[PDB]
C-alpha cells in the first residue's frame, strides 16, 4: 500500500468517526485528539510509516467537513456508519 493511499485511509476514518460523534449523537466516542491517536495506533499495527503522516489532522477535518455538504441525508449517513465502523470504534475503547 502506497503512502499516500494510507493517510487518506486514516483521515477518512477519523472523519467517520467524528461525524459519528457530531451528527450522529455518539456521545459515547471521545475526542479529535483521541480519534487521532487510534488511527495512528491502527497504522503502526499494520507496519506502515507514521512519519510520513503530517498531512492526517488537517486532511481529516477536511474530509468531515465535506461530508457535511455531501448530500447524504444524515439518517443515512448514521445509519450506514453505525453499521460498519465497529473495529475501529472497537480500536478506540484500547485508546
Known sequence: ???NEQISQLASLV???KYLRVQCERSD???DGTILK???NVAVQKGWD???YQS???LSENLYQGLLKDGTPKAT???SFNRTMTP???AMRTV
Open 38 to 40: 487510534t488511527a495512528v
Open 15 to 17: 472523519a467517520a468517526s
Open 29 to 31: 466516542l471521545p475526542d
Open 77 to 79: 449517513q448514521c445509519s
Open 56 to 58: 492526517l489532522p488537517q
Open 1 to 3: 500500500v502506497p503512502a
Open 50 to 52: 507514521t512519519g510520513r
Open 88 to 90: 475501529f470504534l472497537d
